[PDB]
Design an enzyme around this catalytic site. Sequence first.
Site, PDB file in Angstrom:
ATOM      1  CB  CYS B 108     -43.589 -10.484 -62.917  1.00 21.50           C
ATOM      2  SG  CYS B 108     -42.247 -10.565 -64.171  1.00 21.50           S
ATOM      3  NE  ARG B 111     -43.681  -6.414 -61.750  1.00 20.96           N
ATOM      4  CZ  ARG B 111     -44.399  -5.839 -60.738  1.00 20.96           C
ATOM      5  NH1 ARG B 111     -45.157  -5.009 -61.036  1.00 20.96           N
ATOM      6  NH2 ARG B 111     -43.823  -6.299 -59.555  1.00 20.96           N
ATOM      7  CD1 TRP B 280     -34.453 -13.767 -68.988  1.00 20.35           C
ATOM      8  CD2 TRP B 280     -35.001 -12.996 -70.806  1.00 20.35           C
ATOM      9  NE1 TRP B 280     -34.393 -12.062 -69.090  1.00 20.35           N
ATOM     10  CE2 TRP B 280     -34.530 -11.882 -70.124  1.00 20.35           C
ATOM     11  CE3 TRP B 280     -35.916 -12.560 -71.945  1.00 20.35           C
ATOM     12  CZ2 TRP B 280     -34.605 -10.725 -70.538  1.00 20.35           C
ATOM     13  CZ3 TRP B 280     -35.736 -11.399 -72.645  1.00 20.35           C
ATOM     14  CH2 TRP B 280     -35.120 -10.493 -71.765  1.00 20.35           C
ATOM     15  CD  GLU B 285     -38.267 -18.303 -62.829  1.00 21.05           C
ATOM     16  OE1 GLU B 285     -39.553 -18.590 -63.265  1.00 21.05           O
ATOM     17  OE2 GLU B 285     -37.669 -17.369 -63.643  1.00 21.05           O
TER      18      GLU B 285
HETATM   19  C1  HEM Z   1     -38.303 -11.052 -69.475  1.00 27.47           C
HETATM   20  C2  HEM Z   1     -37.959 -11.977 -68.708  1.00 27.47           C
HETATM   21  C3  HEM Z   1     -38.733 -12.457 -67.256  1.00 27.47           C
HETATM   22  C4  HEM Z   1     -38.265 -12.521 -66.121  1.00 27.47           C
HETATM   23  C5  HEM Z   1     -36.882 -12.796 -65.668  1.00 27.47           C
HETATM   24  C6  HEM Z   1     -39.423 -12.826 -65.025  1.00 27.47           C
HETATM   25  C7  HEM Z   1     -39.396 -13.379 -63.842  1.00 27.47           C
HETATM   26  C8  HEM Z   1     -40.445 -13.970 -63.164  1.00 27.47           C
HETATM   27  C9  HEM Z   1     -40.150 -14.606 -61.963  1.00 27.47           C
HETATM   28  C10 HEM Z   1     -39.010 -15.166 -61.157  1.00 27.47           C
HETATM   29  C11 HEM Z   1     -41.394 -14.836 -61.449  1.00 27.47           C
HETATM   30  C12 HEM Z   1     -41.903 -15.668 -60.373  1.00 27.47           C
HETATM   31  C13 HEM Z   1     -42.091 -17.092 -60.790  1.00 27.47           C
HETATM   32  C14 HEM Z   1     -42.237 -18.181 -59.649  1.00 27.47           C
HETATM   33  O1  HEM Z   1     -41.706 -18.150 -58.736  1.00 27.47           O
HETATM   34  O2  HEM Z   1     -43.061 -18.858 -60.032  1.00 27.47           O
HETATM   35  C15 HEM Z   1     -42.491 -14.231 -62.450  1.00 27.47           C
HETATM   36  C16 HEM Z   1     -43.938 -14.241 -62.276  1.00 27.47           C
HETATM   37  C17 HEM Z   1     -44.682 -13.823 -63.189  1.00 27.47           C
HETATM   38  N1  HEM Z   1     -44.368 -13.211 -64.444  1.00 27.47           N
HETATM   39 FE1  HEM Z   1     -42.405 -12.642 -64.989  1.00 27.47          FE
HETATM   40  N2  HEM Z   1     -40.422 -12.910 -65.925  1.00 27.47           N
HETATM   41  C18 HEM Z   1     -40.128 -12.478 -67.364  1.00 27.47           C
HETATM   42  C19 HEM Z   1     -41.165 -12.209 -68.188  1.00 27.47           C
HETATM   43  C20 HEM Z   1     -42.587 -12.223 -68.069  1.00 27.47           C
HETATM   44  C21 HEM Z   1     -43.564 -12.112 -69.003  1.00 27.47           C
HETATM   45  C22 HEM Z   1     -43.251 -11.788 -70.597  1.00 27.47           C
HETATM   46  C23 HEM Z   1     -44.722 -11.854 -68.670  1.00 27.47           C
HETATM   47  C24 HEM Z   1     -46.267 -11.846 -69.188  1.00 27.47           C
HETATM   48  C25 HEM Z   1     -46.191 -10.743 -70.199  1.00 27.47           C
HETATM   49  C26 HEM Z   1     -44.275 -12.153 -67.382  1.00 27.47           C
HETATM   50  C27 HEM Z   1     -45.418 -12.327 -66.418  1.00 27.47           C
HETATM   51  C28 HEM Z   1     -45.447 -12.840 -65.138  1.00 27.47           C
HETATM   52  C29 HEM Z   1     -46.645 -13.202 -64.324  1.00 27.47           C
HETATM   53  C30 HEM Z   1     -48.227 -13.017 -64.583  1.00 27.47           C
HETATM   54  C31 HEM Z   1     -45.968 -13.842 -62.789  1.00 27.47           C
HETATM   55  C32 HEM Z   1     -46.990 -14.589 -61.911  1.00 27.47           C
HETATM   56  C33 HEM Z   1     -46.955 -16.093 -62.022  1.00 27.47           C
HETATM   57  C34 HEM Z   1     -47.865 -16.633 -61.015  1.00 27.47           C
HETATM   58  O3  HEM Z   1     -48.218 -16.247 -60.247  1.00 27.47           O
HETATM   59  O4  HEM Z   1     -47.902 -17.951 -61.350  1.00 27.47           O
HETATM   60  N3  HEM Z   1     -43.227 -12.355 -67.018  1.00 27.47           N
HETATM   61  N4  HEM Z   1     -41.535 -13.650 -63.453  1.00 27.47           N
HETATM   62  C1  LIG Z   2     -43.060 -15.793 -67.849  1.00 29.32           C
HETATM   63  C2  LIG Z   2     -42.470 -16.295 -66.895  1.00 29.32           C
HETATM   64  C3  LIG Z   2     -40.991 -15.994 -66.714  1.00 29.32           C
HETATM   65  C4  LIG Z   2     -40.205 -16.516 -65.757  1.00 29.32           C
HETATM   66  N1  LIG Z   2     -39.002 -16.177 -65.677  1.00 29.32           N
HETATM   67  N2  LIG Z   2     -40.907 -17.707 -64.919  1.00 29.32           N
HETATM   68  C5  LIG Z   2     -42.077 -18.182 -65.273  1.00 29.32           C
HETATM   69  C6  LIG Z   2     -42.485 -19.302 -64.505  1.00 29.32           C
HETATM   70  C7  LIG Z   2     -44.045 -19.403 -64.078  1.00 29.32           C
HETATM   71  C8  LIG Z   2     -44.527 -18.587 -63.133  1.00 29.32           C
HETATM   72  N3  LIG Z   2     -45.190 -19.244 -62.097  1.00 29.32           N
HETATM   73  C9  LIG Z   2     -44.497 -20.868 -61.937  1.00 29.32           C
HETATM   74  C10 LIG Z   2     -44.325 -21.005 -63.508  1.00 29.32           C
HETATM   75  O1  LIG Z   2     -45.418 -21.660 -64.048  1.00 29.32           O
HETATM   76  C11 LIG Z   2     -46.153 -22.610 -63.609  1.00 29.32           C
HETATM   77  C12 LIG Z   2     -47.425 -22.632 -63.607  1.00 29.32           C
HETATM   78  N4  LIG Z   2     -48.411 -22.220 -62.517  1.00 29.32           N
HETATM   79  C13 LIG Z   2     -49.691 -22.239 -62.286  1.00 29.32           C
HETATM   80  C14 LIG Z   2     -50.416 -21.638 -60.909  1.00 29.32           C
HETATM   81  C15 LIG Z   2     -50.029 -22.013 -59.633  1.00 29.32           C
HETATM   82  C16 LIG Z   2     -49.785 -21.301 -58.845  1.00 29.32           C
HETATM   83  C17 LIG Z   2     -49.374 -21.447 -57.605  1.00 29.32           C
HETATM   84  C18 LIG Z   2     -49.359 -22.893 -57.209  1.00 29.32           C
HETATM   85  C19 LIG Z   2     -49.795 -24.009 -57.931  1.00 29.32           C
HETATM   86  F1  LIG Z   2     -49.592 -25.157 -58.081  1.00 29.32           F
HETATM   87  C20 LIG Z   2     -50.039 -23.540 -59.577  1.00 29.32           C
HETATM   88  C21 LIG Z   2     -42.980 -17.267 -66.107  1.00 29.32           C
END
Ligand code: HEM
Ligand SMILES: Cc1cc(N)nc(C[C@@H]2CNC[C@H]2OCCNCCc2cccc(F)c2)c1
Lengths: 404, 404
Positions: B108, B111, B280, B285
Amino acid sequence: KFPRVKNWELGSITYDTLCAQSQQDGPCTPRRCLGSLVLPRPPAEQLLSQARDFINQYYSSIKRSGSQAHEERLQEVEAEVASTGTYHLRESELVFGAKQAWRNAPRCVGRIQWGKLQVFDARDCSSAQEMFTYICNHIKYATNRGNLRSAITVFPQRAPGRGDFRIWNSQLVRYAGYRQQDGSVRGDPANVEITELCIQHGWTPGNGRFDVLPLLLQAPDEAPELFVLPPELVLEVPLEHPTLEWFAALGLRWYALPAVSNMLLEIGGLEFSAAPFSGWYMSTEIGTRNLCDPHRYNILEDVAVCMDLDTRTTSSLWKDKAAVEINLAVLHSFQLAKVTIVDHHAATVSFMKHLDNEQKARGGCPADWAWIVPPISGSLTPVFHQEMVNYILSPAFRYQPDPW
Amino acid sequence: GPKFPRVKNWELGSITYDTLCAQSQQDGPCTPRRCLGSLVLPPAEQLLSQARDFINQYYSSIKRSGSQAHEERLQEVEAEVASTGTYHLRESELVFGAKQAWRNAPRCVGRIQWGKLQVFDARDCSSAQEMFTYICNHIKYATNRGNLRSAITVFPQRAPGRGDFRIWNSQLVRYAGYRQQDGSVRGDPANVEITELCIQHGWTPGNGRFDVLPLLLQAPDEAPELFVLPPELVLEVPLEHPTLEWFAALGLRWYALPAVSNMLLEIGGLEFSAAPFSGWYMSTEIGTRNLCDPHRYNILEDVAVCMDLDTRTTSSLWKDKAAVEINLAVLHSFQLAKVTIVDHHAATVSFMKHLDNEQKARGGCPADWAWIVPPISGSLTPVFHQEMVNYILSPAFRYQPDPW
Ligand code: HEM
Ligand SMILES: Cc1cc(N)nc(C[C@@H]2CNC[C@H]2OCCNCCc2cccc(F)c2)c1
Ligand code: HEM
Ligand SMILES: Cc1cc(N)nc(C[C@@H]2CNC[C@H]2OCCNCCc2cccc(F)c2)c1
Ligand SMILES: C[C@H](O)[C@H](O)[C@H]1CNc2nc(N)[nH]c(=O)c2N1
Ligand SMILES: C[C@H](O)[C@H](O)[C@H]1CNc2nc(N)[nH]c(=O)c2N1
Ligand SMILES: [Zn+2]
């Protein structure tokens, strides 16, 4: 143990079995991944077993594994190490080893070309003067009037009794970086220090943005020597833009030949401290990194202003827009000057094919994901979506300390 | 120097050492032999020590470590496990653990906001219908008519010999993907399976590219129930471009609220199998990945034809140009509709600031370079040039298997 490797665009899966042949540790542990670091920080039996493995790889390559030539060559190597604590490669072996080092290079996206490498044997070099001649030939050959040809020249190996043959410059062709009074840099900021060394050893410096540096060449245990490359050997491309008339007025240019000159080549436990190699550019190297990196020429803003973009906010995407035009300019100008260049789409598409070829041929391919994916438009290229395994195979290129 | 990973920023030339990684109690996929950093997915004894560690973490964070209340809470945790096999978090412990899980997430880039998270305690929820009510409150709260607010709703925890609470959908808001009579997909191809599971459980499907999916919600030991979100709850943004007038005619759109719903939240050995969280968007994305991925909406060609680009050759950088405009359209449309969004430049500059904050506070920040660096304009953002250390800290979000 064997890692499962998935492509996420296609859903296809392979298994890397090649990684079991790694004999050298990288920087990662189960506690933490350090895969994103750029640089992380013999006795007879160890050399002898690296030598055997390589001799084994060589006879496999020519389908003569276990034959009489193979048997007696192993004996020749054991005989030489036992007596002298070192040994020497035959020219064909060196040729195979150089291609294999390229093949094994996890950070190179151009590896589909790996088998097409002109290898110049320079191990009969005893002076910096001779090194210069050999280097000039390499450049003349490699450049080939714009029809670039991959090449490597290999100088004498390291020996325990003495200092190394070295090229001080990191590439055979580089632009000068001059620190100014005002604390800025004219030219390439990456080359401030090597420019200062060139001056310290008697170079009369220019004062331009693109002054080709001279070479500092070093024979064992001697002060380095300074050599100016004849300017007609150094092919350069003036940068214009297909549609933006004003772009040429920026006076930007780059050299045709990408040629690393400070990496160590390691083959069969033998070490080649000076072994410069060259291929051709992928456009993003120049268009994106060299011209747009903030610690390099850093021209993005200048260009965006020319394009009359809104520079007040990031959300206008002025940086992305200007970066695209600059990459376009590099591609256009090289194609106009009839000098070999590949763009990051063509390159990465052919790297995917290389991955497939290597899967069948060897059961895997070591690849460094962060280096293979281009610095703009990453996910628009197929490599972004490809999982990759990174590990060290020998023959290898390695980093080595600067000789000063 | 120090016996902890040295970490370099190559733009600035500054160095840090990561000492936080020492705290890691969970192995990743890498070994000295090979780096697997680019892979997407790779009894009471064990529970009690995880719990102790978490309680120690809580007490350190409120500056009461070693205190009588700290020791009594430890003793209370041990007794509860001793008689029931599990234990339960106090309200403020859950709040702390939930933020810590976000703080600890290597993938993420958002953060810097970690300290501001609305934690909704839903550990009293006892049916699928109630889960629905909870989720509707979350979406209303988090959406806030476009002024988005980070939130997480926590449902009851995995129990020994008792079914999980699960949300089947991967996000609270996702589009249908309908498999067509001719192999192709209408809508989001990533959502074929869940769409088909929705239909199998009695959903009457639409016929559109952007049909909001219903929710499949599962209480312990019960079959999942289907719930349609009231459309007034699901804020969407129609996509238009600032200068390209035809872009609105494409009828592209996206939802405002990015909300992960199938991740496991682990805190002190306790497992929250249903704990959906939202923030948000970063504009890439949607503009880059969701719209332009070959295995998603794949609109690059369509947009490049509209833009009248030469799509027959890679070196015209038609993919790069179209991608830039689609991203710009996303930014501009969200801004117009007054819905919170962040561009990849601002997001990454703010993540750099977060790395400094965390260096000073915890001695490091676990970060997955491949995921932090945006999918367009990589080296144009400060994070490209920053080395990162990746490691698993707890509390954490985990991937978990699909419940069917
Ligand atoms: C506040 C605005 C936020 C922004 C701009 C943001 C941004 C992002 C982005 C760009 C990713 C990569 C997504 C992807 O390529 O699939 C990501 C992943 C992630 N975010 Fe954040 N995020 C935000 C809020 C949060 C919140 C509130 C949480 C949880 C409490 C969170 C937890 C995570 C986690 C666990 C991932 C890993 C997702 C995965 O492996 O599927 N984020 N975030
Ligand atoms: C909280 C939050 C903030 C943000 N800006 N953006 C997000 C997108 C989520 C994270 N990541 C993709 C979106 O969610 C999609 C769900 N992913 C399932 C796990 C997974 C993993 C790898 C391959 C897969 F096919 C599936 C979440
Ligand atoms: C033939 C055309 C070639 C192309 C298009 C190409 C492309 C590239 C690119 C884009 C990189 C990353 C460079 C960077 O970002 O710094 C790279 C790295 C590398 N290449 Fe190739 N290359 C070619 C030929 C060669 C040859 C002939 C060799 C050696 C025989 C070679 C060996 C290497 C090595 C060792 C690296 C890693 C450099 C480092 O780690 O500092 N390449 N190449
Ligand atoms: C052979 C070849 C083909 C090609 N297309 N492109 C190239 C660029 C080289 C490789 N990589 C950058 C360029 O060479 C630049 C000089 N390399 C110095 C080593 C180094 C490494 C990391 C950090 C440092 F501070 C210094 C070579
Ligand atoms: C910190 C990071 O590893 C470093 O900036 C790397 C990232 N990826 C790269 N990829 C290539 N091809 N060349 C580079 O110089 C870099 N730099
Ligand atoms: C193979 C590679 O790990 C994979 O395509 C990853 C790369 N980086 C990513 N980064 C983000 N933020 N999101 C992703 O889905 C991916 N995909
Ligand atoms: Zn690793």
